[PDB]
A = this chain, B = another copy of it.
């Protein structure tokens, strides 16, 4: 009865959340479930409701999707067509010890927490979770690159921008699939690592020169790197997949203008491996809530 006597509100999400809802249930947690009216299924301890029906002063924890909220406090859900906004007013009704869990945050969300004096846990800041999550993200990126190109990834020129937690997983998989992979980064240790991985490193400051023959470009850097000048030198058929958190790292307006297909693609793990991704979150959540 790990989570016995604990009350959590689960607000929105995707298929990943189904794994979280299930595990928390089995551990005897009380669960108020918002944004899942389309969810035909039932679970022990789970009560579906509207955000305006939540009993805030008894909630030990608020579980938001990996994406958190938007700048207006709006929470995404694929299990309802209903709008869900998480306000400051709601959060202040919670007990002092109430903790909010997300994947990532933003200014709006960070500001709510700030002013309401509530703790916020951004699960994606845990390098381990971030690394595990890079696996389905890469899978989704590969699936997309294959789907949206009229040529094979095998033998194509592929650039990955950034050799962080995701970039490292993404680049490795394009290479293992037969792409000629080049990775852009600023840090010398990272450029060294790229070389060690048998890939072609380049200093990120030379993107414009280095991307002129690239067929597929995957951005992981959370900053404007795929600028107009970069885009201007790219082949007309290039596919840019931007994995960086909104607004990403691409001049989408310019890409569009010069006819380069560029997409900002979040939530890939929820789309391609929701069971795997969700169970990972569920496992960590059970542990964290049980502290």
Contacts and interface: CB of A to CB of B under 8 A. Distances in A.
A143 interface: yes
B152 A276 contact: yes
**How many copies of this chain does the complex contain?**
2
Interface string A255-291: 0000000000000000011111000000000000000
Contact of A177 (B155, B176, B273, B276): B176
A274 B146 CA distance: 11
Nearest to A271: B147
A93 interface: no
Contacts of A149: 272-273
A77 to B, nearest CB: 18
A146 B272 contact: yes
Interface in A99-155: 135-136, 138-140, 142-143, 146-147, 149-155
Contacts of A178: 135, 173
A216 interface: no
A15 interface: yes
B140 A154 contact: no
Given A176-B177, A177-B176, A136 B152 contact: yes
A152 B173 contact: no
Contact of A154 (B15, B139, B150): B139
A18 to B, nearest CB: 10
A275 B156 CA distance: 12
Contacts of A15: 150
A276 B179 CA distance: 14
14 contacts: A135-B152, A135-B154, A138-B154, A139-B152, A140-B146, A142-B146, A143-B143, A143-B147, A149-B272, A150-B275, A150-B276, A151-B275, A152-B276, A173-B177
